[PDB]
Amino acid sequence: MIVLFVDFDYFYAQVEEVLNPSLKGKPVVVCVFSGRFEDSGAVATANYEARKFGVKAGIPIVEAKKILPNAVYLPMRKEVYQQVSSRIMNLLREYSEKIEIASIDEAYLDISDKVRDYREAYNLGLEIKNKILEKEKITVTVGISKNKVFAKIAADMAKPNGIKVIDDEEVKRLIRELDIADVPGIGNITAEKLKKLGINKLVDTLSIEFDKLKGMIGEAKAKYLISLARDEYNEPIRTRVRKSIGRIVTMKRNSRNLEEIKPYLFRAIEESYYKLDKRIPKAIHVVAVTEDLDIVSRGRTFPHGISKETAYSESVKLLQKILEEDERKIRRIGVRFSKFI
DNA sequence: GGGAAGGAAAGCC
DNA sequence: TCTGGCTTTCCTTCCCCC
Ligand SMILES: [Ca+2]
Ligand SMILES: [Ca+2]
Ligand SMILES: [Ca+2]
Ligand SMILES: [Ca+2]
E strands of chain A, at which residues? Predict the structure, then answer.
């Protein structure tokens, strides 16, 4: 199998640069303003001009401004990025019927039936990069290898505006030399548990007692890492279908007063229904982020679709259950719908 | 013994 | 200072079915 992975560069910030070319060369920071106070919220992303200074996804906007007070700060316009992403995904479908859209800016294409070797795969990658640059002015990084995981690692190694092939020989080298923390699916918590077992490389998971590995990181992640280390990871490219849609908002001030929370909860329901667009959910979950930042949720599944009026009434009962069962104040409140008909 | 199902944990965008 | 958002697996409990 030959997998070609596409990952758009500094996507949100780059789209803003495409829509306003005068921004190019300047540090641009895309913000997610929570509306709680002046500049409260976090950075969604920033272009490398800003990132090279530590301004990146997830840091508080206030911290970003301490680092680059003169950068351009723009509020996220997800809908615009989503429409642009959709057009690019449509261009990629021309290169393969087997495509897995993984996120707003990533796609895996199985090009096994399209090219004969990595030389041809590489040339197709260039063709794709040029087509997207021609049509949308967006640069991307392409990663090519024998499976999805290595195709993604290839992209990580080449971004931004790059292309890289990790052939069979290099896959074996990486199994021995790649920091295991850099393997997709291994976050800080799993990386710490592994470091604690002396596991710093994929190859190391083959010499540890399986039960010891499984007991520390779980059966699925252990089987996952071992399959990669054995160079036997096989996962087909599959069409993805969204399984959940929701909206969660930040309240002006923390609270556990039902009447004060309701307006936010109902606003989150309205926006969620707008985002469902014809999809009818059979399940609704009310999700609350407590003052200490913990996440609590209560849901209900119906034997039928949930009308908006039913979403309103059931959401209150679920929020009451959250308040009746938890003692903390709520900071953020929302809903999530799933189990579509 | 183990499949489902609810909610938390963890991962990545 | 900690936005928003989606997916998958984990842990626990029910019950032989969902
Ligand atoms: Ca990525
Ligand atoms: Ca990207
Ligand atoms: Ca990692
Ligand atoms: Ca049951």
Answer: 3-8, 28-33, 41-46, 72-75, 99-103, 106-110, 140-145, 163-165, 244-255, 281-290, 295-301, 330-340
**B5 C1': nearest CA residue:** A301
* Nearest residue: Cα versus C1' of B12: A185
- How far apart CA A119 and CA A116 sit, in angstroms, is 8
Q: Which nucleotide is closest to A331, CA to C1'? A: C2
Q: Which residues of A are annotated as a binding site for Mg(2+)?
A: 7, 105
A271 is catalytic: no
A140-145 and A163-165 strand pairing: parallel
Q: Give me ligand 4 centre to Cα A284, in Å.
A: 19
Whether A280 and A310 have beta carbons less than 8 Å apart is answered as: no
Q: Where are the beta strands (DSSP E) in A225-325?
A: 244-255, 281-290, 295-301
Please tell me the distance between residue A184's alpha carbon and the centre of ligand 3 in angstroms. Answer: 7
Give nearest nucleotide to A244 (CA–C1'): C6
**Ligand nearest to the CA of residue A160, numbered in listed order:** 2
Class of domain A167-233: mainly alpha
In CATH, what number does A2-10+78-166 get? Answer: 3.30.70.270
Experimental method: X-ray
Contact criterion met (CB below 8 Å) for A121 and A23: no
The ranges assigned to domains in chain A are 2-10+78-166, 11-77, 167-233, 244-341
Q: Using alpha carbons, select from A311, A245, A305 the residue that is nearest to residue A275.
A: A245
Angle formed at CA A18 by CA A85 and CA A107, multiple of 5 degrees: 25
The total of other beta-carbon atoms located within 10 Å of residue A268's CB is: 22
* Nearest-nucleotide field for A102 (CA, C1'): B13
CATH architecture of the region A244-341: 2-Layer Sandwich (3.30)
Q: Are A137 and A161 in contact (CB under 8 A)?
A: no
